[PDB]
Design an enzyme around this catalytic site. Structure first.
Site, PDB file in Angstrom:
ATOM      1  N   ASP A 233      -2.027  10.014  11.597  1.00  0.00           N
ATOM      2  CA  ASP A 233      -0.650  10.475  11.451  1.00  0.00           C
ATOM      3  C   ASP A 233       0.138   9.278  10.995  1.00  0.00           C
ATOM      4  O   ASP A 233       0.240   8.303  11.734  1.00  0.00           O
ATOM      5  CB  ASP A 233      -0.083  11.022  12.772  1.00  0.00           C
TER       6      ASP A 233
ATOM      7  N   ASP B 106       1.022  17.350  13.725  1.00  0.00           N
ATOM      8  CA  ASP B 106       1.200  17.197  12.273  1.00  0.00           C
ATOM      9  C   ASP B 106      -0.128  17.126  11.535  1.00  0.00           C
ATOM     10  O   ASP B 106      -0.343  16.291  10.645  1.00  0.00           O
ATOM     11  CB  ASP B 106       2.131  16.009  11.950  1.00  0.00           C
TER      12      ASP B 106
ATOM     13  N   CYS C 248       6.722   0.464   6.109  1.00  0.00           N
ATOM     14  CA  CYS C 248       5.869   0.121   4.972  1.00  0.00           C
ATOM     15  C   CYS C 248       4.475  -0.268   5.427  1.00  0.00           C
ATOM     16  O   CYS C 248       4.284  -0.636   6.592  1.00  0.00           O
ATOM     17  CB  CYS C 248       6.508  -0.973   4.116  1.00  0.00           C
TER      18      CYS C 248
ATOM     19  N   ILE D 147       0.842  -1.188   0.000  1.00  0.00           N
ATOM     20  CA  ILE D 147       0.000   0.000   0.000  1.00  0.00           C
ATOM     21  C   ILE D 147       0.892   1.260   0.000  1.00  0.00           C
ATOM     22  O   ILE D 147       0.513   2.285  -0.564  1.00  0.00           O
ATOM     23  CB  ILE D 147      -0.969  -0.048   1.218  1.00  0.00           C
TER      24      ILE D 147
ATOM     25  N   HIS E   9      10.975   5.514   4.302  1.00  0.00           N
ATOM     26  CA  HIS E   9      12.326   5.377   4.851  1.00  0.00           C
ATOM     27  C   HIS E   9      12.364   4.480   6.093  1.00  0.00           C
ATOM     28  O   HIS E   9      13.305   3.704   6.252  1.00  0.00           O
ATOM     29  CB  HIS E   9      12.926   6.757   5.174  1.00  0.00           C
ATOM     30  N   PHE E  10      11.361   4.603   6.990  1.00  0.00           N
ATOM     31  CA  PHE E  10      11.327   3.824   8.232  1.00  0.00           C
ATOM     32  C   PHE E  10      10.340   2.671   8.266  1.00  0.00           C
ATOM     33  O   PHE E  10      10.498   1.762   9.081  1.00  0.00           O
ATOM     34  CB  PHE E  10      11.073   4.741   9.438  1.00  0.00           C
TER      35      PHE E  10
ATOM     36  N   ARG F  85      -2.548  15.254   4.193  1.00  0.00           N
ATOM     37  CA  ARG F  85      -1.792  14.014   3.928  1.00  0.00           C
ATOM     38  C   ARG F  85      -1.923  13.014   5.102  1.00  0.00           C
ATOM     39  O   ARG F  85      -1.643  11.834   4.921  1.00  0.00           O
ATOM     40  CB  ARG F  85      -0.309  14.350   3.679  1.00  0.00           C
ATOM     41  N   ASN F  86      -2.270  13.519   6.310  1.00  0.00           N
ATOM     42  CA  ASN F  86      -2.429  12.679   7.496  1.00  0.00           C
ATOM     43  C   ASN F  86      -3.869  12.309   7.813  1.00  0.00           C
ATOM     44  O   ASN F  86      -4.106  11.625   8.801  1.00  0.00           O
ATOM     45  CB  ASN F  86      -1.761  13.318   8.674  1.00  0.00           C
TER      46      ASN F  86
HETATM   47  C1  LIG Z   1      -1.017   4.998   1.415  1.00  0.00           C
HETATM   48  O1  LIG Z   1      -2.292   4.433   1.104  1.00  0.00           O
HETATM   49  C2  LIG Z   1      -3.064   3.968   2.135  1.00  0.00           C
HETATM   50  C3  LIG Z   1      -2.697   3.954   3.452  1.00  0.00           C
HETATM   51  C4  LIG Z   1      -3.583   3.435   4.437  1.00  0.00           C
HETATM   52  C5  LIG Z   1      -3.283   3.389   5.820  1.00  0.00           C
HETATM   53  O2  LIG Z   1      -2.030   3.890   6.156  1.00  0.00           O
HETATM   54  C6  LIG Z   1      -1.826   4.404   7.424  1.00  0.00           C
HETATM   55  C7  LIG Z   1      -2.400   5.597   7.855  1.00  0.00           C
HETATM   56  C8  LIG Z   1      -2.158   6.055   9.140  1.00  0.00           C
HETATM   57  C9  LIG Z   1      -1.341   5.329  10.005  1.00  0.00           C
HETATM   58  N1  LIG Z   1      -1.132   5.847  11.300  1.00  0.00           N
HETATM   59  C10 LIG Z   1      -0.390   5.347  12.310  1.00  0.00           C
HETATM   60  O3  LIG Z   1       0.336   4.369  12.184  1.00  0.00           O
HETATM   61  C11 LIG Z   1      -0.490   6.082  13.654  1.00  0.00           C
HETATM   62  C12 LIG Z   1      -1.654   7.102  13.808  1.00  0.00           C
HETATM   63  O4  LIG Z   1      -2.470   7.302  12.910  1.00  0.00           O
HETATM   64  N2  LIG Z   1      -1.729   7.764  14.978  1.00  0.00           N
HETATM   65  C13 LIG Z   1      -2.607   8.849  15.205  1.00  0.00           C
HETATM   66  C14 LIG Z   1      -2.116  10.091  15.594  1.00  0.00           C
HETATM   67  C15 LIG Z   1      -2.981  11.149  15.803  1.00  0.00           C
HETATM   68  C16 LIG Z   1      -4.323  10.942  15.614  1.00  0.00           C
HETATM   69  F1  LIG Z   1      -5.168  11.977  15.814  1.00  0.00           F
HETATM   70  C17 LIG Z   1      -4.847   9.738  15.226  1.00  0.00           C
HETATM   71  C18 LIG Z   1      -3.977   8.680  15.018  1.00  0.00           C
HETATM   72  C19 LIG Z   1       0.863   6.457  14.270  1.00  0.00           C
HETATM   73  C20 LIG Z   1       0.066   5.366  14.890  1.00  0.00           C
HETATM   74  C21 LIG Z   1      -0.761   4.135   9.573  1.00  0.00           C
HETATM   75  C22 LIG Z   1      -1.020   3.703   8.299  1.00  0.00           C
HETATM   76  F2  LIG Z   1      -0.466   2.546   7.869  1.00  0.00           F
HETATM   77  C23 LIG Z   1      -4.199   2.876   6.717  1.00  0.00           C
HETATM   78  C24 LIG Z   1      -5.408   2.416   6.214  1.00  0.00           C
HETATM   79  N3  LIG Z   1      -5.752   2.426   4.933  1.00  0.00           N
HETATM   80  C25 LIG Z   1      -4.844   2.936   4.039  1.00  0.00           C
HETATM   81  C26 LIG Z   1      -5.197   2.964   2.672  1.00  0.00           C
HETATM   82  C27 LIG Z   1      -4.330   3.461   1.742  1.00  0.00           C
HETATM   83  O5  LIG Z   1      -4.571   3.536   0.396  1.00  0.00           O
HETATM   84  C28 LIG Z   1      -5.712   2.842  -0.127  1.00  0.00           C
HETATM   85  C29 LIG Z   1      -5.615   2.849  -1.634  1.00  0.00           C
HETATM   86  C30 LIG Z   1      -6.025   4.187  -2.227  1.00  0.00           C
HETATM   87  N4  LIG Z   1      -6.073   4.221  -3.695  1.00  0.00           N
HETATM   88  C31 LIG Z   1      -7.453   4.441  -4.163  1.00  0.00           C
HETATM   89  C32 LIG Z   1      -7.505   4.448  -5.678  1.00  0.00           C
HETATM   90  O6  LIG Z   1      -6.524   5.330  -6.247  1.00  0.00           O
HETATM   91  C33 LIG Z   1      -5.915   6.135  -5.232  1.00  0.00           C
HETATM   92  C34 LIG Z   1      -5.192   5.289  -4.204  1.00  0.00           C
END
Ligand SMILES: COc1cc2c(Oc3ccc(NC(=O)C4(C(=O)Nc5ccc(F)cc5)CC4)cc3F)ccnc2cc1OCCCN1CCOCC1
Length: 286
Positions: free
Chosen positions: A167, A149, A40, A33, A37-38, A153-154
């Site tokens: 985030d 942050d 996946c 997905i 750098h740190f 993007r987040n």
């Molecule tokens: C890059 O693409 C994606 C990333 C995703 C994803 O990634 C993360 C997001 C946040 C965290 N956060 C974290 O690991 C943490 C966090 O979120 N903490 C936190 C901090 C503050 C807060 F308020 C709430 C939470 C750090 C722990 C971790 C993740 F792994 C989680 C769930 N679904 C995802 C779907 C994605 O694409 C789907 C495909 C899309 N395509 C559609 C068709 O074409 C376009 C592309």
């Protein structure tokens, strides 16, 4: 091959309360997905035998205690977030070999910045996304949680177009690298006092929220494109702000200027922002 005995015991205890047995989780390593750098992110299936589609976050290397502890700490900070506009934690899978895995509900439409840059959301839809972020932030601010942050993007977007404040932390995708600059800080989203002190508050999240509303109204334009990352403080101190986007309503621009008030204490709370943006949203037919 992590040694849990070398980690903080209170941290390990917290991880154990949200543990996912390695047999309940199927990680599709060929179905990447995102790569950074740190860490996946992969597609995953979490099992009554009902299959739950999830995103599985991993570390690239498991050699540094600090990185492993930070990775688990990021996951643990999330555990008690229970709000329709804040990303939730499905659990943490500790394996005998390899990186621990942080399991998140799968977000069909990915991050909000990529979404709005891709679909044809109306001006009311975009304001609605901002209102959803403000609600998620009103909830976090009530728990005295400082984001540090906030940016499009987040923020994640699920299959029902529900925005989830998140985030990426250690799973920061390589394309996002340009937005962080030397600790690597998101300077173009930061409040003036934070650029000068590197200290963050709910009032500096409010400044970031105003930038996020600007991102929404421009359908994902990068802020201050002609300003060098290390010169943003000089630029702002000349008496400048992001310009009003063409389809941004005047009252929404006024809210942005209030979010960027030079005195942090004078910026509106997330509670006031939800109230003000609900009103602006309601004026549009849809
Ligand atoms: C890059 O693409 C994606 C990333 C995703 C994803 O990634 C993360 C997001 C946040 C965290 N956060 C974290 O690991 C943490 C966090 O979120 N903490 C936190 C901090 C503050 C807060 F308020 C709430 C939470 C750090 C722990 C971790 C993740 F792994 C989680 C769930 N679904 C995802 C779907 C994605 O694409 C789907 C495909 C899309 N395509 C559609 C068709 O074409 C376009 C592309």
């Amino acid at each position: 091959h992590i040694d849990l005995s070398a980690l903080n015991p209170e941290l390990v205890q917290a991880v154990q309360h949200v543990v996912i047995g390695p047999s309940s989780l199927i990680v599709h390593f060929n179905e990447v997905i995102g790569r950074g750098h740190f860490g996946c992110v992969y597609h995953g299936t979490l099992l009554d035998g009902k299959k739950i589609h999830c995103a599985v976050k991993s570390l690239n290397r498991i050699t540094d205690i600090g990185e492993v502890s930070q990775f688990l700490t990021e996951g643990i900070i999330m555990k008690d977030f229970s709000h329709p506009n804040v990303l939730s934690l499905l659990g943490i899978c500790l394996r005998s070999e390899g990186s621990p895995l942080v399991v998140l509900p799968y977000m069909k439409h990915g991050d909000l910045r990529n979404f709005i840059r891709n679909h044809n959301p109306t001006v009311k839809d975009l304001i609605g996304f901002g209102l959803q972020v403000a609600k998620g932030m009103k909830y976090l601010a009530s728990k005295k949680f400082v984001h540090r942050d906030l940016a499009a993007r987040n923020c994640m977007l699920d299959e029902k177009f529900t925005v989830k404040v998140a985030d990426f932390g250690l799973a920061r995708v390589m394309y996002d690298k340009e937005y962080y600059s030397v600790a690597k800080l998101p300077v173009k989203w930061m409040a003036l006092e934070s650029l000068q002190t590197q200290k963050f508050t709910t009032k500096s999240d409010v400044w970031s929220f105003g930038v996020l509303l600007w991102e929404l109204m421009t359908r994902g334009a990068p802020p201050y494109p002609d300003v060098n990352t290390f010169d943003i403080t000089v630029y702002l101190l000349q008496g400048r702000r992001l310009l009003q986007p063409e389809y941004c309503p005047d009252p929404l621009y006024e809210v942005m200027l209030k979010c960027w008030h030079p005195k942090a204490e004078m910026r509106p709370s997330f509670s006031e922002l939800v109230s003000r943006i609900s009103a602006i949203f309601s004026t549009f037919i849809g």
